[PDB]
Each structure stands twice: as C-alpha cells, then as structure tokens.
C-alpha cells in the first residue's frame, strides 16, 4: 500500500515497534545507494571533460558515501567494508547498536565495459571491535543489495521475505514493484565462469556436464555469466536456476567474500525460498573467522542447489 | 576538441562537405537513443504504480521513438526494424536518400533481470522498396550502438574508426570519452552460450576446449556471457577476446539477425581493427537475401577470430 | 543537526517528540508529492506531448491536486483534506482514516504558470477535534505543522513543526531534500515592500499612506525597493530570507481580501511567526481568525516586525 | 516545422540559410552552456557540498561565466566575447578564431539567486567588422542572432535569427529543448506594467505621469496590474508572452539607466522587436544606440507597441 521504499520501511518499523534506530540506518543506506546510482550513471561527466575549462575514484567515492551516511545515522558501532583493511569503529559520540558489512561497489572492475554493478550489505545487532562483525549469517537483522543495471533496483529483507524496489529517477524515490518474491523451485540457467574448468573439482565438472548433456530427455540448461555477482545473483532470483563460484585449484578457499558478499546474498536467496551453500555447509551457518574471509558460493533454486550438493557428496 | 557528440557529428559533416542530411539523420537517431535511455532507466515508474491515483511496452515505445525521429528527419526513404514484419517506406513528402536498419531495443527479453540492453543501427545510401535494405555491410555509411548498462554509451563509426561517447544525464548530452578505439590483437575472454554445447559443430567444440585447456602453457581464457548482444560485443571491443553465436544443430542458420544486429556490430568491430565472420565469410560480405535473415556470428580480436577460423577449416 | 536529508531530519524530530510515526508518515507523504510536482513543473516528459514517439496548465493543477490527495490519503494519517481545487472538504475513506487534517494549495501561483514564473505548494496540518469539514475550520493557532515548496530557480521547502523554520533544497541528482538552513530568523526591519500597486485606486487610506512613505520616506532614509512576483509563495519566501514586507490588503474590489485563509494565509503566517516575523489581517493576527468557511478569504500583511508595525500604525491611525 | 528539437531546428535553419555551419556550431555551443547552467542553477550536486561523502552565489556566477566562455571559444566560431563578468573584452586565441562576436550576461538576476527567484542567461551575436573590443561596439541593428534562457519554474529559451521569435522548453528527462511556439507575436496592447516603483522619488516627470495613468486611468478602463520580479529576463519574458510594458528608465540616481546595452538591452530589444513589439531608450530605439564602451548602461522601455507608444507620448510631452 505504501508505494515508496521510505514509507514502506517506516511502516515496517512501526509494525516492529522499533525505536526508529534501524529505520534511520536503512534510510541512510538507501540515501547512499541513490548517490552511488547517480555517480555510476555518470552525472557530472561533462565537467570532468572540460565543459567549464577544467579537464578507481568511483570505488573511493562509493565507499565514502556509505561510510559517512551510516556513521551519521547514529545507528552504528562497527562497519566492515570491502575497501578497508580494518573494521571501522564508529566514534563513541555517534554510536548505536548495529553492525554493517558492505561492499560499496561490487563488480567495479567491470565499470570499464559498463557491466551491471551493485552495492551489497548485511546488518547485525551488536566494547565495540571487529569481533562484532564476525557473527554467522543466521544472526542477520536485515540485508539486501542495489543493482545498477538497465535500471536501478534494490532487493531488501528484514526477515519477512524479499521485496523489490525500483528507483524512479524522475521522482528520486524507490517504488515497491514486487512484494515477497519467491525463487522458482527449479530453473533452467546455470551461471559460473567455465574459464576455470581446468581447475574445478570432480563434482563441479560432473554437475556442469549434466546441465549441458542431460540423460533424462530434458533440454540442456542455458548458460549466463555476467561476471558481476549482484547481476548474476539477481537474475538467479527472478528467473531461477543456479549461480556458482565454487573453490577451485587456484582459489582453494573460494573467491567471494563471506561477510559482505556471500552472507548478504545468501540471506536474500534463502528468504526467497532458495538455498545457498559453500558445498560443505549453508553459507549462513559458516562461523566467520576473519572479516575478509573468502568462501565458496553456490546458490539459487532449491532443487538445483540440491542436485549440486548431491554431486558433491558423490565425489 | 568538440566535446559533445552533437558538435562532433556536426564538425565531421562540415569536414565531409555534406549537405546536412546525414547529420540530421544522426541527430535524430541520437535523440531517439536519449529518449530510450530515459525510459529504460524507468523515469515515470511511480506514475505507473499509482502515485497520482492511477495504477513489451518498452519494445513498442522504443520502436516508435526511432521510427518517428528517423522519418521526421527528412533524411530517410526505407527503414527496417527488428519489430516490424515489412520494411517501412518513408512517406514521399518526407523522403531523403538514406536507408536505416535497426533493432530499437536489443536484449529486451532481459529487461526483467535488469541486464544491460541496447539499440543497434546501420545506415545505407539508397523507387524505394525493401530491396534498398538488402545491401551488403561493405556498403555501410555509418553504424553504431547504444548500450544501456551501468551508464549509457554510444559507439559510432562513419568510416574513420570507432568513437565512444557517454551520456551525462545531468547535462543531457553525450560526451566524447574515447576517439579511434582499437581492439586488442588478442584477448583473454571467450563469450558464448555453452548451454548449447550438445548442439555445437566440431570446430566450435574444439575451439572452446582450447580456451579452457590450452596446450602451450598459457592460462585458460576467462568466460563471460551476459546474453545481451550489445553488452557482450561492447565488452569484446574494450577488453578484447572473442564473442560467438555460431550456427548449431537447433539454429542451423544461426540466431542473430544480419541487417540490424550482425552487420552493424561487424562494421564497428572491423573499424576498430577486429574481425567479424559467419564462419564461412566475413559478415560484411554476406549478400543479404531477406530483411530478417539470420546469420552465425563470430567476432572480436583478430588473432582470436583467426584461431576460430583455423578450427573451422580443420573440421 | 547531522541528519543532512529532510527524510532523516523529519524522522529524527519524530523520534525526539516520541511520536507514534503517524505525523512522520504524513510529512514523508507530502514531501513525496512535492518531489513529484517539482518534476512535472520543470516539464519532465514534455517531448512526448509534442510527438517524439508519434503521438502529439489546468493539466498541471489537476495533476498536482491528484498527487497530494493520493499521497496524503494513502499515508493512513489523515481524516479530512481541504484543497484549493475542491469545492468541498474531502473525507478520508474510513479504513484509511488517521487523526490529522490537511489544508493545502497544491499549485499556487496560477497567473504565473504560462510565463514560467516561480510557483509553489502550501500546506497546514491540524489534529482532528465523525470527521467533517468542521475539523478544518480551526484557527491557525492550532497548527501542528506547516510549510511550503517553492518551484523557483531551484526547488526549496520551508517547514516548521513548532520549533522554528528550517529550509531544505532539492538536489535533483540525488532525489532528496538537503537541510541548508536551520532555525531561520527574519530580519527585524527590511528594505523591500511587495504588493500589487495596480490596485492603488481601490486601496484604503492606511495602505495609500504606507506605500507613500515607502517611496517618499520622512526620516532621511533611502526609499524601499519594490518587488512583486505575483506568486505568493515566491514573494513570501523572499520576505522571509531578505526581510521587508508583503501585502495583499483588503481593497474596494476585494473587501475581505483575495488570498485564502485555510491554505494560503494561515500556513505562511505560521512560518513567518515561527521565524520571528508578524502576520496580520490588519486588525488581528492571521492565526487568530476563526475560520467560518473552508474557502474564506482574508487580508494578509506579513514580514519583518518593524515593517508590519509601521503598517499597523497606518491602519490604527486611519481607522480612529 | 517538424524538427521538434532545438538541435534539429537550428541545423535545419542553417541548411536553409545555406550557411557553412559556423553559426550553427556557435548556437549549439551556447545552448549546451545553457543546459549546463540550468543543471547547476537547479542545484544538482548540492548534497556533496553539504557533506554526503564526508566533505562539507559568486560560485554560480563564475561557473556560469566559465561554461559560456569555454563552450563559445571551443566552437571555433568566435573572435571576440564580451561578458557581464569581465572588465575587458575577451579575444579568442588565434588558432580558434572564427568570425562571430558574442555579447552575453551568463547569469542575469543577481538580486534574486538567494531567494530562488527566476534568473536567466542573455546573449547577442554579431559578425566581425585584427579583432578587438571595437568589434563588439556595433549597434543592435547589426545583430545576427540573439536570445535568452529563463531558469524559472521550467527552463525556456527564446531565440531569433531574424525571422521572428521561437520558444523552446527544456525537457529534463530527455536532455533537449523542444519547440513549443513558433513565430510568437506580442499583444498590441497589454494590461500589466512592470518597473521598480521604489525609485518613484527619482523618476522624471514622464515616468511619474505614465505610472499615475496606469493606476488611475482617464478613459474609464480598469487600472493595469503590476508585476516586477526584479530579474530582467523573467519580467521581459512575461511581457513577451502576456503583453504590457517593462521599464527601467533613467532616474536621478541612474541618469543613464541601470541595465547594460551590449548584453542585456540590445538582445531583449532584438527579441521584442522581432515579436512585433517596441524597445526604446525613451528617446530612440535601443537597437539604434551606437555603443561607446562595452559596459555602457542605457534606459530600457519595452513591450506591447500601444503601451510603449503611450510611454513615449509622456516623454515627448514632458520634454517639450
Ligand atoms: N524498519 C524496519 N523494518 C523491519 N524491521 C524493523 C524496522 N525497524 C526495527 N525493526 C525490527 O525491530 C528491531 C528493533 O528496532 P530498533 O528499535 O530500531 O533497533 C530491529 O532489530 C528489527 O528486527
Ligand atoms: N556528420 C557526418 N559525419 C561523417 N560523415 C558525414 C557526415 N555527414 C555527411 N557525411 C559524409 O558525406 C556524405 C554526404 O552527406 P549528406 O550530403 O549529408 O548526404 C555521407 O554519406 C557521408 O559519407
Ligand atoms: N516528525 C516530527 N517532527 C516534529 N514533531 C513531531 C513529529 N512526529 C510527531 N511529532 C509531534 O508529536 C505529535 C504526535 O505524533 P504522532 O503520534 O505521530 O501523531 C505530533 O502531533 C507532533 O506535535
Ligand atoms: N542555424 C542558422 N539559423 C539561422 N540562420 C543561419 C544559421 N546558420 C547560418 N545562418 C545565416 O547564414 C549566415 C552565414 O552562416 P555561417 O556560414 O555559418 O557563418 C549567418 O550569419 C546567418 O545569417
């Protein structure tokens, strides 16, 4: 009923009988995301190219947008960013009770070819230190992502399923476009970098073979891989299927990051009725041991993820 | 020096000692592209969702934008659109000498997952009929594409190499960001739907094997496939490598369309020093026989395309 | 504060007031309608009306009204709305009913749309006292919050919830209002006077005497400058930020004034008073007028207190 | 025509004139600077100044000036520029030199930025007669093209290249100016008069007599309405589209007028004349004044011809 993400989030906080602290935190995150979308679409580019006579930065700017909007919310005590070596402890004067792990601009190596890129975040309730960010994903309070693709979208869950919002740039607000989205039980797309096939384990090799060469008279799955995690994960949510960045010979711990990439999208996919696993346990059950820890990631439609796990247990 | 695409195109027409007719045509195309970018990013979405009490269309709108901007230019006599069964003959009162083939919104099945999508066009100099659009790609006067990705970009050539422009949404104009772009002689990315491997020919199977399992001590290529042709072709241009939608058992004539998909991107890639082939001849040398003809498409860095052709000739 | 955006700022003020979140949702709703109106006023989508895809004022009035009514009703915070555009009060559907009453002019500055002059949106919010138009007939002393949006060279909102006036500017690249001045105070005395002197023939003696003294001062000072955009929000906002006086007094052709008490004069009188200025009908504060009908007119004289005092002095002298 | 956008329209007019494309490139350049200025006036990027990423008027003047100067110089169409913001004429670098001279006010309406009133950009283009400021001292009769942008509730450009006045509105969703009225003609007689009556004490007899007749007509008609935004582009544009009269005459404190001949009065006089109106100093057409210095001031009275005639009549009578 509420139409805009601002009114929707407020109304959900009123229903939760919250003090307004998490609401201010979500308000601040979403404001950072609007500022990042504006910069990603290249507002102001002409000034860069000398229109007024004056002729990686996006990484730094997006990081600064999130850090400053979150710290000034008075809702946080600890932040972990993909862009910072150490946890960032909120100034005592501005301390609230939430911990936020985020990748402010994910996929951002691919800005050069203008691929879809995004922002990922997970929020936890907490003397503050990096240990406060080492909670397993089962403890998530809220999480979500922004996708800067053909349009700008946010996926958000606070524990009651997944809602989708799209940014209307004429209005400057996110509009609710889908409530309580559920992933297909089984899809027909598989998504991984097959350029690593030389380094796969046996299970992964066998699983990919079954997708391309089925034995049960079914059509082979179609393949997609943007190489931008938010884009591939969002397509998996809305179309169904499976997304994988498993461990391989060259990346034995996996490549994607547990705190601010894997846990947030695992939380979204599970809230949507999907599964997300390292191949040996659910991602949300991994007890994090360091803030920039890598883990393997396999997620999507539950029947597809289940077939993958069945290959793993075989081999 | 000219900074904006409008001034650049005008200055190029002055240098060509043109009558202004092709310039008005390019002006009209670019205006259509700005209108499409605005709609693709979802300006006005909130009005759709009832903000004022009033609660495939993008395909139709983009088609109408291009057709109306081109016809009203007074520069055209024949249009071919991906969206129309028959060629569209310009009203005699508005007739000029150019023929335009275009796909007004390509990749547009993928709007639902917000994948990058685009607009592709090729322009020919011409009693007008569909036969006027059946010229081989060697006859192209100008061609290019718009990519609606993390930002909006245009690639444009009028026969003197490829220039890249980016839309600054704060200014409302395209800004020149790269002049005379040249593709790498050899890249390290291969791009195709391996979900069709069951249906590949021997050459394609062998080529993909060599990318994943090289014999000369080199690292395997990385794999990318957005499944949106403009996005994959633009990444091939700026990063190098190879893009393929070859014929297969299920699509024996190929899938992509010669007039308004394959010829325009072949023209751009060759202008940039790359190669584009059906696997039996250069795309730009194919003599079109029908306006919605399909052809196989293999293009990108010349050494990569050459390795592919060497596999084809082998098998 | 540190809140930076209007959204965080309004939320935080609601937290401090220990509200239930109902007035916050109402204010969020109004401000969303104001952003939608700004977009339309600046003519987003004009090219489509002029046939870019092959298909070629009252418009904008109706649209702006529909934006405000729908955003307010769907907030679940309202029971009664009064609009400049509707003859009767609009009663909120019972299942959406909350406790607030909103009086608004969704797009003020009619004489000016066609020449692109600055125009605006004006509103005042009351708490209800079964709902009916009588809930909107409260004197301005009962205002809970009030404000205006100015669609000028940039889009600005002035808002007060009873602790002074704060000014916010819309950053169109961000899509949000940014706090640019907190607790603004009007100058004690200005140097601009603002009224339509084309009604000179119809003025009362007091107005004639006051205007004459602005042009031909008796104290050795320079005459005041004159400005009159003819769009009340633009003139009142300049009065707020530069000081001076704005007037649309009663005259022979408009013996009760021209401007509307509920949704033009009360809201701006509240803003001006909250900023340390004065707002009078000429005989009493605008905020003390007891409304008798929802489209009632009243005379309006407002701005810097020394200036409004000099005008009231002309009134009492000429009335004695 | 059918051209729809300002870009196609200007290109097509250049094709019809059989130009080399040099004036077209100059006009494209000016219009790009105007879009960049509109974006900045509406405060794109404000949130970044206020610290959204941790980093917290004269500004806008300098920016707008730099936008116009760089876009014009890089067109390769110019040899001499005169700006309201620069003491001396600006000579184009020899390797960028073309044949046109441009006089402009990059951001007119200073008294109004802070209160967000409508403001604008004004320009006039001449063909050169080695380049120096003398190439800018041509009377307005030699104008090749002239125009203004109004940053009001929406952004509008008025442009004439000598075949009447066309009006274009910026669609900010598209990023282009759209033709909204071709060959606009001012009313023969209006019902609005526009001047700063705060200078009444300093007026000449003619101005005093004229203003008195607007408020107290002698012919049984209703008095004229008054409007005065105090930003010349806004007042002149309203005069164009609603009719009536706009004045900033000489007065005792400004005996040669206040507004600037080269880049305020000549351009708008050209626009007004092209639309069938009159523009006078009070003693001769503005376009006939032979400029003697690049920041020369002149009195300006312009608008509907019957109104300007009634003002000129007051002048001749009171001068006899
Ligand atoms: N806007 C919201 N949406 C959903 N849940 C919320 C919201 N605000 C608060 N909650 C829930 O209530 C708890 C307490 O909120 P808070 O008092 O603001 O820290 C949160 O940790 C959430 O579980
Ligand atoms: N803006 C332009 N950029 C590059 N080449 C152009 C341009 N305008 C015209 N030409 C070239 O000159 C030819 C004649 O132009 P036209 O007289 O406008 O039909 C074209 O077919 C192009 O080869
Ligand atoms: N966001 C706010 N800003 C200022 N005052 C507020 C706010 N929200 C609530 N209040 C005050 O608290 C009262 C009750 O709030 P509510 O429970 O939301 O109706 C209001 O009528 C205001 O006086
Ligand atoms: N785009 C245009 N619109 C109207 N008149 C033009 C245009 N371009 C050129 N002209 C006229 O033709 C003359 C010579 O043009 P140019 O060769 O571009 O300097 C100009 O000084 C104008 O009088």
Numbering used by the authors:
A (entry chain B), B (entry chain B): 9 to 63, 71 to 141, 146 to 334
C (entry chain A), D (entry chain A): 8 to 63, 70 to 142, 146 to 336
How does the study describe this entry?
Fructose-1,6-bisphosphatase (FBPase; EC 3.1.3.11), which catalyzes the hydrolysis of fructose 1,6-bisphosphate to fructose 6-phosphate and inorganic phosphate, is a key enzyme of gluconeogenesis and glyconeogenesis and, more generally, of the control of energy metabolism and glucose homeostasis. Unlike liver FBPase, the muscle isoform, encoded by FBP2, is expressed in all vertebrate cells, both in glyconeogenic cells (e.g. muscle fibres) as well as in cells such as neurons which are not supposed to synthesize glycogen from carbohydrate precursors. Mammalian muscle FBPase is about 100 times more susceptible to the allosteric inhibitors AMP and NAD+ and about 1000 times more sensitive to inhibition by Ca2+ than the liver isozyme, and it has been hypothesized that it may be catalytically active only upon association with the muscle isoform of aldolase.
Inactive FBPase in the T state in complex with AMP [T(+AMP)] crystallized in space group C222 isomorphously with the structure reported previously for the E69Q mutant of human muscle FBPase by Zarzycki et al.. The asymmetric unit contains two independent dimers, chains A–B and C–D, corresponding to the C1–C3 subunits of the tetrameric enzyme. Crystallographic twofold axes along x (in the case of A–B) and y (C–D) generate two full tetramers (A·A′–B·B′ and C·C′–D·D′, respectively). Each FBPase subunit in the T(+AMP) state binds one molecule of AMP with full occupancy. The ribose is recognized by the side chains of Tyr113 and Arg140 and by the main chain of Val160 and Thr177 via a water molecule. The O atoms of the phosphate group interact with the side chains of Thr27, Lys112 and Tyr113 and with the main chains of Thr27, Glu29 and Leu30. The muscle-specific sequence allows the anchoring of the N3 atom of the AMP ligand by a water molecule, which is held in place by the main-chain C=O group of Thr177 and the side chain of Gln179. When, upon the R-to-T transition, the leucine lock is broken, the Asp187 residues are no longer isolated, become fully deprotonated and change their conformation to form hydrogen bonds stabilizing the catalytic loop L2 in its dis­engaged (inactive) conformation. Specifically, the Asp187 carboxylate group of subunit C1 forms three N—H⋯O hydrogen bonds to three consecutive main-chain amide groups in the L2 sequence of subunit C2. Binding of AMP and transition to the much more compact T state prevents the aggregation of muscle FBPase and increases its thermal stability.
